[PDB]
Amino acid sequence: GNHFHVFVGDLSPEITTEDIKAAFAPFGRISDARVVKDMATGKSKGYGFVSFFNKWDAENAIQQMGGQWLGGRQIRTNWA
């Protein structure tokens, strides 16, 4: 049932859903992933979410991706 969700902040303007899933893919299997965009406009809000099936995969991803560079900018991670 309830999956395990990860908040990814400080994303580059043109980091896409595809990109963020490609970046978090090696940490375990991804149930879902998206970069949050404004509706009316369609611009990256500067953050996104990645969801895993395993609690361990999420907890690990938070620690290994925290402060890691994605695009030309350092991302931060936390529980969602």
CA–CA gap between residue 69 and residue 43 (Å, rounded): 20
Closest CA to 22 of 63, 47, 50: 50
Domains observed in the chain: 1-80 (3.30.70.330)
Q: What technique determined this structure?
A: X-ray
- Give CA torsion, residues 55, 61, 63, 4, to 10 deg: -30
Tokens coding 40:
């009316």
Residues after which a C–N gap over 2.5 Å breaks the chain: none
- Give CA torsion, residues 25, 28, 34, 35, to 10 deg: -60
CA–CA gap between residue 26 and residue 43 (Å, rounded): 26
Tokens 């995969």 map to which residue?
57
- State the resolution, in angstroms: 2.3
Indicate the angle between helix axes 17-24 and 55-65, nearest 10 degrees.
100
φ and ψ at residue 48, rounded to 5 degrees: -160, -175
CA–CA gap between residue 35 and residue 73 (Å, rounded): 15
Tokens 């994605």 map to which residue?
70
